[PDB]
A and B are shown apart, each in its own frame.
Chain A
């Protein structure tokens, strides 16, 4: 599936030792056609009580509740998507929703209200690529000493590093990685071209770490 493909793609680049080239030509691996459509722009870890709330770059909001269910509010402010633990999806609206979801809608709004007003948008300067097509939800997440790892249902894996605020957005369908550096500049690369042309030690180190993180996701 997506994670197995991502692992293969990362291993292939990492095995090639991209930073150890005679002449690294990192810029030759850039491909703006592979810029992602979706990534996580902000998040709140309230997992001691309710779960993890997050906002995607399209200003939609989601919550992965502690009971392994998900509720998504589209950026129109009314459309909802509810995903049961099985993955069973239901579409509804805030204006017309079963009373059984009132509590979870209320929790999502508390998350939304906080995030719209008070957190920075990751990738605020990134224009998504032109698309056609499905809104993803948060499948899994965890935190380590160095990063928070966010796995979306479209296969994308996002890794936000705590120390220096650098970020990776990995897509196994594009076989691409977007790297946001500490200055918030960003580049999108085709992983196969990073294997061909190489890259700096900073990006190579984060791609080695990313492979370790995908191993963790695979082990659930």
Chain B
């Protein structure tokens, strides 16, 4: 999973 800043 990827996240915003």
Q: Is the interface of B mostly helix, strand, loop or mixed?
A: loop
With both beta carbons as reference points, the residue of chain B lying nearest to A162 in the complex is identified as B5
Size of B's binding interface in residues, CB under 8 A: 5
Within 8 A of A (CB), among B1-5: 1-5
A44, B5: Cβ atoms closer than 8 Å? no
Chain A residues within CB distance 8 Å of chain B: 40, 42-46, 48, 119-120, 122, 143, 148, 160, 165
With both beta carbons as reference points, the residue of chain A lying nearest to B3 in the complex is identified as A44
Residues of B close to A119: CB separation below 8 A: 3-5
Q: Is the interface of A mostly helix, strand, loop or mixed?
A: strand
A48, B1: Cβ atoms closer than 8 Å? yes
B5, A122: Cβ atoms closer than 8 Å? yes
Most chain A Cβ neighbours within 10 Å, of B1, B3, B4, B5: B4
Which of A46, A48, A143, A165 touches B5 (beta carbons < 8 Å)?
A: A165
Which of A46, A143, A148 touches B1 (beta carbons < 8 Å)?
A: A46
> How far, in angstroms, from A5 to B5 measured CA to CA in the complex?
30
Residues of B close to A148: CB separation below 8 A: 4
A160, B4: Cβ atoms closer than 8 Å? yes
With both beta carbons as reference points, the residue of chain A lying nearest to B2 in the complex is identified as A45
> How far, in angstroms, from A160 to B5 measured CA to CA in the complex?
10
B4, A43: Cβ atoms closer than 8 Å? yes
Residues of B close to A40: CB separation below 8 A: 4
**A164: shortest Cβ distance to chain B, in Å?**
11
Chain A to chain B contacts (Cβ below 8 Å), 23 pairs:
A40-B4, A42-B3, A42-B4, A42-B5, A43-B4, A44-B1, A44-B2, A44-B3, A45-B1, A45-B3, A46-B1, A48-B1, A119-B3, A119-B4, A119-B5, A120-B4, A120-B5, A122-B4, A122-B5, A143-B2, A148-B4, A160-B4, A165-B5
